Amino acid sequence: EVDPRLYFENRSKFIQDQKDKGINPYPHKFERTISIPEFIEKYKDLGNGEHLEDTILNITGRIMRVSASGQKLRFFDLVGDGEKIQVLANYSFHNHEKGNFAECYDKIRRGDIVGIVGFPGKSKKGELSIFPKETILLSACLHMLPMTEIRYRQRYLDLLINESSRHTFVTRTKIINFLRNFLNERGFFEVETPMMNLIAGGANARPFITHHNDLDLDLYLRIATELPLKMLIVGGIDKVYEIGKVFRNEGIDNTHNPEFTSCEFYWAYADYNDLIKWSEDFFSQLVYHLFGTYKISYNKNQPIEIDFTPPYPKVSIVEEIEKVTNTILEQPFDSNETIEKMIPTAAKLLDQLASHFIENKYNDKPFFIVEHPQIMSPLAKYHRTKPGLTERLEMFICGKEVLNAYTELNDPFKQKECFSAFCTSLEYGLPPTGGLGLGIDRITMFLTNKNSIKDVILFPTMRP
Amino acid sequence: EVDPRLYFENRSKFIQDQKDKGINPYPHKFERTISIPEFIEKYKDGEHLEDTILNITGRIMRVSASGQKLRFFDLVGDGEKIQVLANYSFHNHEKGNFAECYDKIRRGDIVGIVGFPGKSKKGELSIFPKETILLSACLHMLPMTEIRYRQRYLDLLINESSRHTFVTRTKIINFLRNFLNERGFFEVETPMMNLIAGGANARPFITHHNDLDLDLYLRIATELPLKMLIVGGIDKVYEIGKVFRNEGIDNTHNPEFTSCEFYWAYADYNDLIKWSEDFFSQLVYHLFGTYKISYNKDGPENQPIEIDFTPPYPKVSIVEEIEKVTNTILEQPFDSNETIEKMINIIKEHKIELPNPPTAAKLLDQLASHFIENKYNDKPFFIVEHPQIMSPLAKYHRTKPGLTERLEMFICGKEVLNAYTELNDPFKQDSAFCTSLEYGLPPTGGLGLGIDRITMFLTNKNSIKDVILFPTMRP
Ligand SMILES: C[C@@H]1CCC[C@H](C[C@H]2Cc3cc(O)cc(O)c3C(=O)O2)O1
Numbered sequence: 032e033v034d035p036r037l038y039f040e041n042r043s044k045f046i047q048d049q050k051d052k053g054i055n056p057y058p059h060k061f062e063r064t065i066s067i068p069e070f071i072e073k074y075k076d077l078g079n080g081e082h083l084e085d086t087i088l089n090i091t092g093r094i095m096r097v098s099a100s101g102q103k104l105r106f107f108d109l110v111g112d113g114e115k116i117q118v119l120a121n122y123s124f125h126n127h128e129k130g131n132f133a134e135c136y137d138k139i140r141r142g143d144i145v146g147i148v149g150f151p152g153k154s155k156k157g158e159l160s161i162f163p164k165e166t167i168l169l170s171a172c173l174h175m176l177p178m179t180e181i182r183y184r185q186r187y188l189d190l191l192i193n194e195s196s197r198h199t200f201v202t203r204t205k206i207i208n209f210l211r212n213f214l215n216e217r218g219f220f221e222v223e224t225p226m227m228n229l230i231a232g233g234a235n236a237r238p239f240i241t242h243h244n245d246l247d248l249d250l251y252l253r254i255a256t257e258l259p260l261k262m263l264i265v266g267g268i269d270k271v272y273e274i275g276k277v278f279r280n281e282g283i284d285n286t287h288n289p290e291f292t293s294c295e296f297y298w299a300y301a302d303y304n305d306l307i308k309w310s311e312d313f314f315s316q317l318v319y320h321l322f323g324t325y326k327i328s329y330n331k332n333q334p335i336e337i338d339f340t341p342p343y344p345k346v347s348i349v350e351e352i353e354k355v356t357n358t359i360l361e362q363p364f365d366s367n368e369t370i371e372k373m374i375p376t377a378a379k380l381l382d383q384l385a386s387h388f389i390e391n392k393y394n395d396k397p398f399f400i401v402e403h404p405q406i407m408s409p410l411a412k413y414h415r416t417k418p419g420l421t422e423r424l425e426m427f428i429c430g431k432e433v434l435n436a437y438t439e440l441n442d443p444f445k446q447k448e449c450f451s452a453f454c455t456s457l458e459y460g461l462p463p464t465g466g467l468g469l470g471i472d473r474i475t476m477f478l479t480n481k482n483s484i485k486d487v488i489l490f491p492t493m494r495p
Numbered sequence: 496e497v498d499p500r501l502y503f504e505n506r507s508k509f510i511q512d513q514k515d516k517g518i519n520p521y522p523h524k525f526e527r528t529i530s531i532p533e534f535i536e537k538y539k540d541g542e543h544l545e546d547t548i549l550n551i552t553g554r555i556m557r558v559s560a561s562g563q564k565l566r567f568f569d570l571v572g573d574g575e576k577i578q579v580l581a582n583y584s585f586h587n588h589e590k591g592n593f594a595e596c597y598d599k600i601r602r603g604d605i606v607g608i609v610g611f612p613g614k615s616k617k618g619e620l621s622i623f624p625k626e627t628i629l630l631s632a633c634l635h636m637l638p639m640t641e642i643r644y645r646q647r648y649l650d651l652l653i654n655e656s657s658r659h660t661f662v663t664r665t666k667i668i669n670f671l672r673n674f675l676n677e678r679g680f681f682e683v684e685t686p687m688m689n690l691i692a693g694g695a696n697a698r699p700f701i702t703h704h705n706d707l708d709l710d711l712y713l714r715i716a717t718e719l720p721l722k723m724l725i726v727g728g729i730d731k732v733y734e735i736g737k738v739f740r741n742e743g744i745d746n747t748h749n750p751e752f753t754s755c756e757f758y759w760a761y762a763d764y765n766d767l768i769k770w771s772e773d774f775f776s777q778l779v780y781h782l783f784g785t786y787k788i789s790y791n792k793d794g795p796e797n798q799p800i801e802i803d804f805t806p807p808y809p810k811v812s813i814v815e816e817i818e819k820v821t822n823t824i825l826e827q828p829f830d831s832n833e834t835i836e837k838m839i840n841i842i843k844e845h846k847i848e849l850p851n852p853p854t855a856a857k858l859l860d861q862l863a864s865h866f867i868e869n870k871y872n873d874k875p876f877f878i879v880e881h882p883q884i885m886s887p888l889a890k891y892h893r894t895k896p897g898l899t900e901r902l903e904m905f906i907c908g909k910e911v912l913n914a915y916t917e918l919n920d921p922f923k924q925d926s927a928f929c930t931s932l933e934y935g936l937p938p939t940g941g942l943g944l945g946i947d948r949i950t951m952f953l954t955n956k957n958s959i960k961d962v963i964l965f966p967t968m969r970p
């Protein structure tokens with residue numbers, strides 16, 4: 032019925048026309064006495080047709096529906112904090128000294144933010160409403176709202192229109208709150224490490240790089256928090272952690288965003304077994320805390336049930352490939368004879384072999400791949416009984432990695448061999464320690480039934 | 496006196512020699528039954544409990560002896576210390592010669608001890624080992640500079656105050672997070688890398704994403720995306736996190752620092768003032784049991800000053816106060832030639848450094864920081880009502896032409912909080928951002944904090960480098 036540019040340009044003209052005649056169409060302050068959630072909670076118990084004309088409230092919110100019986104009766108839907116109530120504006124109840132009813136309400140469109148002074152009640156039908164004496168425009172919406180990629184570029188629209196979108200992001204903040212408290216209860220101490228560093232260690236990933244002008248120095252954005260957090264373990268913070276963005280300069284897809292939110296903790300006097308027990312407590316507890324159960328459903332078409340009831344399976348990556356392929360790969364894995372017997376180095380061959388024959392062994396429970404070779408795991412400690420291997424675990428949910436942990440290599444000698452501030456700190460004595468990383472975005476995806484990482488990040492990185 | 500390289504090289508030989516004897520000098524796991532704090536709490540109350548056998552761990556920080564059959568150590572874990580009294584008598588001799596075992600244990604070593612709790616005749620709380628295991632040797636000699644910054648792990652082990660500083664830091668951040676959560680604010684993460692870099696007036700860092708072939712700016716503030724969330728209908732939203740400014744480094748500037756911004760739909764400048772006074776007074780009482788704390792502006796060497804955080808705090812209106820102290824009316828527009836020149840002439844008469852290019856915003860900023868930013872040292876205080884030309888995102892004052900509904904709080908001359916009623920008129924004002932304003936931003940109050948700087952005052956530090964674990968430094 033309406034062109035959008037015309038609409039935009041007319042609402043613009045209206046705003047200036049208000050200005051030019053004195054009205055301030057963007058008032059500074061509307062003193063509100065109740066929120067929409069508070070309103071519902073207080074007045075749901077009313078009878079149908081009941082008005083409390085005695086009781087005057089100031090309320091605010093955004094108009095999302097506009098309707099009318101005729102000129103002297105207008106209806107709107109008013110939303111605040113994910114809740115909605117009806118505004119039933121009736122000519123006769125209008126404080127007419129403050130403005131002509133028809134001109135006051137004809138200028139109120141879908142998307143406008145308003146302030147309303149009026150009395151609570153219900154329609155005969157039973158609809159909970161505010162009945163205004165005065166409705167003030169506090170901030171106009173200049174575009175027509177919708178009744179694609181837009182969810183990502185214009186997230187504010189998504190949050191207003193789709194009830195589920197908001198629910199996804201509340202869950203997100205809850206998940207992060209749960210984790211933070213889970214660790215705080217267990218005596219972990221939260222810290223911030225630097226985002227920009229001269230070296231960029233902690234994982235195997237191409238880094239972003241930037242420049243500081245006044246120091247004339249190039250810097251790498253951190254690809255992980257591992258190295259500085261161990262330094263703090265040396266510094267005597269026995270249980271330490273960090274939740275925060277890390278940056279990897281690799282391609283973007285459903286399960287990759289160039290900046291993502293991770294959590295790493297390090298735990299002095301711990302090892303892989305404790306890390307396994309912690310992982311099983313954390314996930315089972317988190318999921319119960321959100322759903323009242325350990326089985327969640329997910330839409331990997333029809334959904335599947337993921338059962339987070341512990342324990343979980345622990346598949347040993349060498350013993351399992353050897354099992355299913357009926358072939359021995361002797362422990363010098365980067366040797367020519369073993370590299371061949373697989374077949375672009377040994378680390379990437381194992382990654383592909385694992386990524387085919389092992390990472391989707393289970394879909395109906397989360398599970399662990401354990402005991403990765405030293406050649407894949409340069410900071411993980413050597414296995415206490417199994418030459419060539421390490422005390423490492425990675426948890427997987429539906430084929431994607433969400434948790435990576437190991438007993439930390441704390442021998443400065445067995446480490447220079449896998450390759451400075453960090454190297455030196457190891458020489459001051461790192462205690463035996465267990466370390467663990469989490470993919471918070473990825474975990475959020477499963478727990479909010481999303482199948483892109485872009486759905487659980489408010490502003491995912493996109494091209495222009 | 497021992498050469499440090501010899502020391503390092505000998506402890507190295509010791510480690511290998513352990514390897515070759517079959518010993519694993521970096522064991523995987525010592526099952527401990529109690530932490531040092533737990534130990535102190537349980538045994539504060541000259542007696543031995545030879546019956547109770549504990550496994551404990553920690554770092555040796557002092558080494559001493561009364562001959563061969565009696566060795567003393569200080570063992571530290573989680574900021575606490577107890578004594579290790581190793582006594583030939585109680586030693587399990589099956590496990591090895593007493594003298595050889597304890598001769599090999601040096602300052603800095605991490606150990607695992609199996610033994611019994613007690614107190615010396617003198618009364619020092621101790622563990623009395625039956626067996627001590629080396630878990631991880633310290634290959635260098637610990638100290639009894641800049642090293643605090645490059646080797647923070649050393650700082651944390653040696654200086655009790657350093658650790659305290661960083662516990663206070665995390666506590667401050669916990670308090671704030673709960674302070675807002677209690678009041679219904681919702682925490683979010685916004686992007687660190689953006690196509691535009693608004694939010695404040697600061698040169699940004701720039702970086703590049705390869706697969707998208709795209710340049711990106713590291714965020715200089717969280718303001719713009721957080722208002723977008725206000726439009727999106729999160730009425731009370733916040734973020735605590737790093738921001739990045741590519742400008743110089745000094746006592747009060749680190750290229751990455753931690754801020755907190757919150758935005759609060761339907762609030763304004765007055766609510767922001769009430770909040771600020773509640774937050775600071777409550778934070779300080781929560782840490783110290785009082786509202787007045789002492790601070791070493793001049794330095795530890797010099798006499799401190801008391802800062803009183805009892806509310807209300809002074810509100811100095813920036814135009815009233817400059818015109819007051821300089822005896823001048825500054826006509827508007829402030830960017831007019833006649834006023835710009837008059838500001839140039841005030842700065843000259845008072846013999847002050849004139850700014851980079853002499854723009855009006857930068858001249859007012861200098862006038863303010865010379866005549867106003869140090870009006871008080873004994874309490875925090877507010878500078879309010881800054882001109883629009885200094886405050887491009889702040890809303891226009893509801894009664895005061897030319898001005899804005901802005902406040903900045905100062906402690907000892909440094910800015911730690913900047914807040915205003917948000918300009919939400921897309922006309923009086925990033926394209927994504929500019930466009931969202933066209934969808935309707937409610938009247939909203941917005942507020943920013945410098946966490947590092949607040950930490951400084953609340954832990955008596957004179958540099959921002961003292962409250963950041965790894966400050967950025969030259970190599
Ligand atoms: C620190 C956590 C510990 C668990 C494993 C996880 C893998 C990480 C990989 C990754 C790469 C990337 O370029 C963009 C991303 O978003 C992600 C992601 O989300 O998960 O890393």
Ligand SMILES: C[C@@H]1CCC[C@H](C[C@H]2Cc3cc(O)cc(O)c3C(=O)O2)O1
Nearest residue numbers: 740748749752754911912913943944945
């Ligand atoms: C966002 C908060 C709002 C309160 C005021 C505060 C000022 C900020 C200035 C600054 C610039 C810089 O380049 C490095 C820095 O560390 C700092 C700093 O610490 O404080 O900013």
Ligand SMILES: N[C@@H](CCCC[NH3+])C(=O)O
Nearest residue numbers: 234255257435466467468
């Ligand atoms: N830094 C690892 C996570 C921690 C593993 C245990 N140190 C990663 O980026 O995947």
Ligand SMILES: N[C@@H](CCCC[NH3+])C(=O)O
Nearest residue numbers: 695716718915941942943
């Ligand atoms: N973003 C501002 C904080 C102001 C808060 C009010 N919008 C800053 O960087 O200083």
Ligand SMILES: [Cl-]
Nearest residue numbers: 299300301527
């Ligand atoms: Cl433990």
Ligand SMILES: [Cl-]
Nearest residue numbers: 286287431432
């Ligand atoms: Cl991956």
Ligand SMILES: [Cl-]
Nearest residue numbers: 063760761762
């Ligand atoms: Cl409010």
Ligand SMILES: [Cl-]
Nearest residue numbers: 764765893894
């Ligand atoms: Cl006012």
